[PDB]
Amino acid sequence: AAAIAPGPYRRVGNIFIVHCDDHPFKHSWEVNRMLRELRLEFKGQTTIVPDIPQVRKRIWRVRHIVKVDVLDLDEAKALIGVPEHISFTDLASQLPPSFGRVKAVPSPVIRSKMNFMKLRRMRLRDVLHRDALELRLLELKRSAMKNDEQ
Amino acid sequence: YSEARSNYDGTSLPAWPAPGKKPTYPAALSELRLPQPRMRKTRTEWMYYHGHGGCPGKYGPSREIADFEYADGTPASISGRRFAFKHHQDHLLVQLIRAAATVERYDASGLLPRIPGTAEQRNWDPAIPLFLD
Amino acid sequence: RPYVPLGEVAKLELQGDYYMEGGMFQEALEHYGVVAKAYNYAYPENHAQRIGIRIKLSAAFRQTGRLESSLANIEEVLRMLDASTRPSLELICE
Amino acid sequence: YNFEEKFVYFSPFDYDRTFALVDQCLERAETIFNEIGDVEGAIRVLQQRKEM
Amino acid sequence: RYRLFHPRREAIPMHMCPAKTIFPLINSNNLLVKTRNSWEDFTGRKEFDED
């Protein structure tokens, strides 16, 4: 109506699809480190990253090896095909935290430590399950003995 | 029997228009912003446009549709590489969702600067106006 | 065996299992109805797939609230297990 | 490094679905016994679950 | 040409892997996640039918 949108206003961000188009290893180690921060190590690899100052800095640094595409939050939501009322924050909270490489750990030794602890806690789950069963059985037997005494 | 899907839901855009109507055509020219050079799309670009990730065997029906099926309709087993590809697609979805969530959280906290670019880009590129105030 | 899109009916069964896990028991029951129809048409009598889908359908009925229907379906499942030969230990336990 | 392979663990709850089914059935039986107030039944069913 | 100008949304198509793959009940106001966490989590092939 040739006037400003008469309603509550919502801020909408952007998401960058970054595709590596040149051999990253042929450049200086700073460029390769920025690409790895963008999660790129080989030509033909594509990644999805947030539109934030740090990501913008990295893409600006490596703009001659990276081709960028933009997707507003609305466009990304339409692309994935989810209801508009659902929030990417809700989706993130729902999805598991141990999906893949949980986090970039300081060193592969620490990564091996993390995997070892994952397996150790997996085993401890069953160990504690059995131990709790034993404890409940012991409590039931103690109660039965008390009742028999009474 | 045979299968032919371009979308997960199996829906497809109307391919054949009404009789006697002028049909829609794709953009033969490349997606380059500048009017020149005026180059036609490459075969790989056409593959990207039609959905295959540049190669016949990367994405699309040739990658998502089972290559065989028992005559009585029983489907095929889940290969290790099939499960790995499904995990890769889920990983792409997770990356997208996590990036969107990070952007939303930054917006809520108030970290998204009102200025277009970073200091380096701003002092390198004249196209960004001056936001001093 | 007659041809049946067992791939599509398996998609429906997986969707029904997801509905069960999500608590949408009516939707799970609706999907299991189609899956059971397809399995009944496709597989022969007293078949492992048929008894399994009947188990799932009985569970869906019980969760929705049709306790009598669930009891009847599970009783028929037990009858089919008795009639069959070398039934799966996991299947009979479930 | 890469010593998680020396401790690789596979859960029986995942690699034997019959075991998980029976464990759940015994848990439900124990709950039913507790609700009813029975003691011997709960003790025997829990002990059998532990033995499994 | 090896200098192709196509959108990277095309480079990574999301047509056959929509959100419903991991959130099957999303369209019905139910946010249940069933995502294949890692290739490491692969119990192996399993027969669809006994026949």
């Binding site: 790895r36 999660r39 790129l40 190590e41 080989f42 033909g44 690899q45 594509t46 990644t47 893949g100 490489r101 592969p108 990564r111 | 290790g80 590489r81 499960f83 790995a84 590809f85 995990h87 890769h88 990983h91 | 030969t85 070398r86 039934p87 799966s88 230990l89 996991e90 009979i92 | 596979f10 690699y15 019959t18 | 290739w39 490491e40 692969f42 119990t43 192996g44 092939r45 399993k46 027969e47």
Partner: peptide, 28 residues
Amino acid sequence: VTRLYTSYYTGVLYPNQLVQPKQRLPAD
């Protein structure tokens, strides 16, 4: 090196992937 798995990775074959035949009740 360190792997990011930003690209498709084929799952490594492992003995835990053996097709386990389900236990069947005896025929007698």
